[PDB]
Amino acid sequence: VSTLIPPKVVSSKNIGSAPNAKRIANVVHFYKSLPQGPAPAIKANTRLARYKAKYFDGDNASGKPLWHFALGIIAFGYSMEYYFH
Amino acid sequence: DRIDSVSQLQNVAETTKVLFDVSKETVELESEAFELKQKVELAHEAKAVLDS
Numbered sequence: 001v002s003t004l005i006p007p008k009v010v011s012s013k014n015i016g017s018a019p020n021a022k023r024i025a026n027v028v029h030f031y032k033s034l035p036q037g038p039a040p041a042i043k044a045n046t047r048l049a050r051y052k053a054k055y056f057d058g059d060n061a062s063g064k065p066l067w068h069f070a071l072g073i074i075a076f077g078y079s080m081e082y083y084f085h
Numbered sequence: 086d087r088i089d090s091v092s093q094l095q096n097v098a099e100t101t102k103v104l105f106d107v108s109k110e111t112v113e114l115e116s117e118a119f120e121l122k123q124k125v126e127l128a129h130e131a132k133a134v135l136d137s
Binding site: 002003005007008010015016019023 | 087090091094097098101105108109112
């Protein structure tokens with residue numbers, strides 16, 4: 001008999017139902033987000049970090065470190081091969 | 086797309102202000118029309134009876 005008032009009732013529930021769950025999921029991660037490679041930490045030195053940076057990095061990612069390890073184990077084992085036989 | 090949808094609440098309240106005001110205003114301003122209806126009916130009856 002009178003005029004009910006829909007057009008300003010969105011205060012109680014934000015428009016949409018499915019994207020409401022994703023709103024909180026995607027709005028919160030943008031605060032603590034790296035602008036462009038912040039704190040890359042590409043430089044380190046712990047007597048083995050240089051080897052990791054030079055060979056164990058994703059830029060090369062080749063089979064050369066495995067061959068170097070094989071050569072090193074051969075060099076180490078030559079001495080005890082002489083010692084045993 | 087949500088941004089585009091929410092862009093349309095920006096100024097709805099300002100217009101619906103006057104909308105909700107004038108809605109009830111005009112709906113209740115027919116009281117003078119209701120008071121004029123009985124006078125018009127009395128006038129119609131008077132003209133009809135003297136025509137009779």
